[PDB]
Symmetry: C2
Subunit: 288 residues, 2 copies
């Protein structure tokens, strides 16, 4: 039984706690709301009064909090991380990973690795589970056996910030897929159709879209914006989604997409493909 500490017992933190218990370690936990540890006490888990007491109990510290800001608040009075390895599974930006790595190095930590869990809690540890890890290969290799408790890990880079970079890119795709899906189900539901029958009809079409993504990535890399689906036509179809929604009394998402396509047309990029939109983003810090 290796000693492990866990900071954070939210939806994901409790899923992590159960995986670590199942795999046979001596777990110490801390959470702002100590009552979230109730389901772990029967399984032989120690609840530490403070973040400092939690970190003192183990050589390996797992963190799964809401955000970077909560992480820095929680680590404020954790003064001695000498001989400790930090595994940070908290979502944030590439620079926020560098900021926590620096905070823990300043306090004597042996090593920092960052992970992005890419499944909901119920899939953690199951065969469908993937976690992206970044940081020094020797530190990943040191932790690989512990980390197997939460499912498959993918070492994506020795650069501490890269798991968060890739996390933020993949969650952009997830955000967009869910924005389109919520809009779709709102339309079909208000129109009196069955959402589950709609999902069956849709799923072929959605897997076809996923097959197009690598061709689009190649066009973006190669700056090849010519094809058979110009932004003028795409924008006309997005405008018809708004009017379909208005006709039904349903609200309208995809506003940022309409605004960036509208400006692309004004810049004379109306004849380009969807690849044409990437340069609209890469050259200007703006919320569309």
């Amino acid at each position: 039984k290796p000693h492990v500490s866990l900071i954070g017992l939210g939806n994901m933190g409790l899923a992590i706690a159960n995986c670590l218990i199942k795999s046979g370690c001596k777990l110490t936990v801390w959470n702002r709301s100590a009552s979230k540890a109730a389901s772990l006490v029967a399984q032989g888990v120690t609840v530490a009064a403070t973040p400092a007491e939690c970190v003192a109990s183990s050589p390996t510290i797992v963190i799964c909090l809401l955000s970077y800001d909560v992480t820095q608040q929680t680590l404020d009075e954790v003064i001695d991380l000498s001989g400790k390895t930090i595994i940070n599974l908290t979502n944030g930006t590439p620079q926020q990973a560098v900021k926590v790595a620096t905070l823990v190095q300043q306090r004597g930590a042996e090593s920092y690795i960052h992970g992005a869990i890419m499944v909901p809690p119920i899939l953690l540890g199951q065969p469908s589970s993937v976690t992206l890890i970044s940081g020094p290969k020797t530190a990943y290799e040191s932790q690989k056996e512990l980390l197997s408790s939460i499912g498959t890990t993918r070492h994506v880079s020795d650069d501490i910030a890269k798991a968060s970079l890739l996390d933020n890119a993949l969650l952009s795709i997830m955000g967009g897929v869910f924005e389109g899906w919520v809009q779709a189900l709102a339309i079909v539901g208000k129109a009196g159709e069955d959402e589950v029958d709609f999902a069956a009809l849709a799923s072929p079409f959605v897997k076809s879209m996923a097959d197009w993504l690598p061709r689009i990535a190649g066009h973006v890399r190669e700056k090849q914006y010519v094809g058979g689906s110009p932004l003028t036509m795409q924008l006309e179809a997005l405008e018809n989604i708004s009017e379909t929604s208005r006709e039904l009394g349903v609200g309208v998402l995809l506003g940022s997409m309409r605004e960036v396509m509208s400006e692309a047309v004004k810049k004379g990029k109306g004849g380009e493909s969807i690849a044409g939109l990437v340069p609209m983003l890469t050259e200007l810090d703006k919320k569309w």
Copy 2:
């Protein structure tokens, strides 16, 4: 003689793809386009170019329309006053009510029948059996046009209701607009960070097919009004905010504004603990641009 007579109105990206599919399947084609020069590649293959929309419709018993919009369709059919003995196949993207408006316009003018279709692939994939076109309108009219329409791929008759193909088109294109908004954001981030877009597409591929798998479960939750799970909107909104900050760190713009705005309002209305299924009632109960 042998080959069926077919008229096509519109020779844009998709209209030209249709023209080539109809030629290849062995039909006798008459075309009209605002820009007559778009027919140059069809004239060798033996197609007739009509001077006006009316003369085009006069040449054939079956009329295919593939124009930009309803507004352009209405304008283009302004002087098409006689549709007696003509079946109308409208493949122009528009709203459910615009499909009803065109069906009524062509009835008034004596059309035999009207079906609406939504092509769900780019022009280069038209004619592949795997390319699906959704068709709505009278079953008998669809069944009589099924052999002609097999030129452009596999057709799926979704409803006798003329407006249904456009309803389902607008819903499927909502998903495509979302997917592409997220994909453009993702490629802007990884590109500006100096990563390879093509290796990122490969890394991403598993993760995106996993999401398609989650959609029927979410649809069930929305139908059953089950909004409780392990991925609360407060946590999802924090992650979306970190996409904005990641982008700002790279000097890159940010999309997904409507998604941040509707999740913020959910959190404000006490639905911060709910799953993504909890957003659907935010849309269904209020006409609003987020």
